[PDB]
């Protein structure tokens, strides 16, 4: 029996382990996009840098959940990380739309995890989710929505995509 565990439901512990995998998956997707935009035949360095930083953030989200698991006396169980769904991501706009949709799926999963935590009356976990995850997700979704509108205004192809990429760099 873990000496620190208190008011930590096994359903919460399992859902966190599933969420760690999702965060690692998203890290991997953004890493693929990052290097997709450094191909000699794409050469969008601003987009590359945006997705590299996003990739790093997602791995930090995974690590914060892993640390959270250990703090509550849960046990981390790591699974395989699926390959990204694409190898090639299209235009800058198509990648930002893909990222918008991923960020929303992650948000949905975090809200499901918040409801699991509430149903088990775990206010420490609901607080973690509100302060460190749900707020970041909403800011990110808004940021990516702004970027999509801006790229569609400026481009979304050709000189406009070239200009927008520099504001990202």
Q: Does 14 bind a copy of itself (CB under 8 A)?
A: no
CA atoms within 13 A on the CB side of 62: 21
Q: How far from 153 is each of 24, 44, 144, 164, CA to CA, in Å?
A: 33, 18, 14, 10
Query: How many Å apart are CA 108 and CA 73, to the nearest integer?
Result: 25
Q: Does 145 bind Ni ion (CB under 5 A)?
A: no
- Binds Ni ion by CB under 5 A, chosen from 90, 119, 123, 145: 90
90 binds, among Ni ion, a copy of itself, Fe ion, none (CB under 5 to 8 A by kind): Ni ion
Query: How many Å apart are CA 154 and CA 169, to the nearest integer?
Result: 16
Residue 14 beta carbon to a copy of itself: minimum distance, rounded to whole angstroms: 14
Asked whether the beta carbons of 23 and 13 are under 8 A apart, the reply is no
Residues 50-69 binding a copy of itself (CB under 8 A) are 63, 66-67, 69
Q: How many residues bind Ni ion (CB under 5 A)?
A: 4
- Residue span 9-48 as binding mask against Ni ion, x where in contact by CB under 5 A, dash where not: ----------------------------------------
Q: What is the DSSP letter of 83?
A: P
Q: Does 58 bind Fe ion (CB under 5 A)?
A: yes
Residues 69-88 binding a copy of itself (CB under 8 A) are 69-73, 75-84, 87
Helix (H) or strand (E) holding 123: helix 123-129
């Amino acid at each position: 029996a873990s000496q620190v565990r208190q008011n930590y439901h096994e359903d919460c512990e399992a859902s966190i382990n599933k969420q760690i995998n999702m965060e690692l998956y998203a890290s991997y997707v953004y890493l693929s996009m990052a290097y997709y935009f450094e191909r000699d035949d794409v050469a969008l360095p601003g987009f590359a840098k945006f997705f590299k930083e996003s990739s790093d953030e997602e791995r930090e989200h995974a690590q914060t959940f892993m640390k959270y698991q250990n703090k509550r006396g849960g046990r981390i169980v790591l699974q395989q990380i699926a390959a990204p769904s694409m190898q090639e991501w299209g235009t800058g706009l198509e990648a930002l739309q893909a990222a918008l949709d991923l960020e929303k799926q992650v948000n949905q999963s975090l809200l499901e995890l918040h409801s699991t935590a509430s149903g088990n009356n775990d206010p420490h976990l609901t607080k973690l989710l509100e302060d460190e995850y749900l707020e970041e997700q909403v800011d990110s979704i808004k940021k990516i929505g702004d970027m999509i509108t801006k790229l569609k205004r400026a481009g979304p192809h050709g000189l406009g995509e070239y200009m927008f990429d520099k504001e990202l760099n």
